[PDB]
């Protein structure tokens, strides 16, 4: 079993959208300055290797990442791991290395379409009146900007709840489930 070759194959199966998701889910471990030049999965994987969060004897964070972006094909094909195992692994307290807050945010972005995204940008242009938002931003970039302005965080969901309420109610359902589990 060649470790580096398996990492390369997994990286070859991941496009730029998958990579943006993986970078968002790793924000608490890879800071912005190191995130900027990451343009393929290998670079990302190599940074995870430098922190020893990914090595031949420790695939936990890689499996968690691939599970959170719903790449079960890669789990089964390259890591010999099924969906149930992950599910029973991540429910054991203390083993999930991606915070429930980050995951929550990602899941919200998974349920927002393009029109819902444009209305989201309009409502947040409302809350931040002194800065034009970039016109290409996805919801993850918006969340990152909100975190930078400390108007969004583990204990600051007011603006997120308000904007989501003016868009769709299932988003509020996701938020409230996150709040109740904690």
């Amino acid at each position: 079993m060649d470790f580096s070759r398996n990492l390369y194959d997994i990286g070859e199966q991941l496009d730029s959208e998958d990579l943006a998701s993986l970078k968002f889910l790793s924000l608490d471990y890879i800071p912005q300055r190191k995130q900027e030049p990451i343009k393929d999965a290998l670079m990302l994987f190599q940074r995870l290797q430098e922190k020893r969060m990914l090595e031949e004897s420790n695939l936990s964070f890689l499996k968690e990442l691939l599970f959170r972006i719903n790449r079960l094909d890669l789990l089964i094909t390259y890591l010999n791991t099924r969906k149930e195992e992950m599910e029973r692994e991540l429910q054991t307290p203390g083993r999930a290395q991606i915070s429930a807050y980050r995951v929550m945010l990602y899941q919200i972005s998974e349920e927002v379409s393009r029109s819902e995204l444009r209305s989201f940008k309009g409502g947040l242009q409302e809350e931040i009146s002194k800065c034009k938002l970039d016109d290409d931003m996805n919801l993850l970039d918006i969340f990152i900007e909100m975190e930078k302005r400390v108007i969004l965080g583990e204990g600051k969901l007011d603006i997120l709840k308000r904007v989501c309420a003016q868009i769709n109610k299932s988003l509020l359902k996701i938020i409230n489930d996150y709040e109740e589990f904690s």
């Binding site: 912005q32 300055r33 995130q35 430098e50 020893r52 975190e147 930078k148 302005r149 400390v150």
Partner: protein
Amino acid sequence: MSAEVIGQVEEALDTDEKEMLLFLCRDVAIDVVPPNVRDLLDILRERGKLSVGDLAELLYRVRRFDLLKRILKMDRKAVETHLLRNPHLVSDYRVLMAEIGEDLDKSDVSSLIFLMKDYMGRGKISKEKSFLDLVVELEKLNLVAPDQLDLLEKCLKNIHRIDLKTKIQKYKQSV
């Protein structure tokens, strides 16, 4: 520990990691200004500031845990034990500056340098230089210091990085 281990460490680090290493040791290597990381590590060794624990702290500060394992045969918890039980080579202020720098991308650093050109000449700092280069230039002008962070807080606020201002305020309250 030897010159071979230092050679390994130097060969394994990239340019940004080396520059960060030089920055983190500015309060230890203030007797002299080392020109590169080889000479810095040699001076720290000769002055008794580069034991295995000291080098491990340095590698931990640049977050090269892979190098911790490969060169020194240690993990994060041994390094944290060493830090809890012995004085730190790198002050919390230097750690804070490095963390701020690692949370800033090229556009934020460009904006910060632009805002600091009101406090220094246009020729003092190039457009593409890093956040740590900028903080060094501010230290030479006595505009930032462990007990003097209000200007940095104001500039971080002006680029809408309230998160980094929050990190600074946490550091302040910890003292």
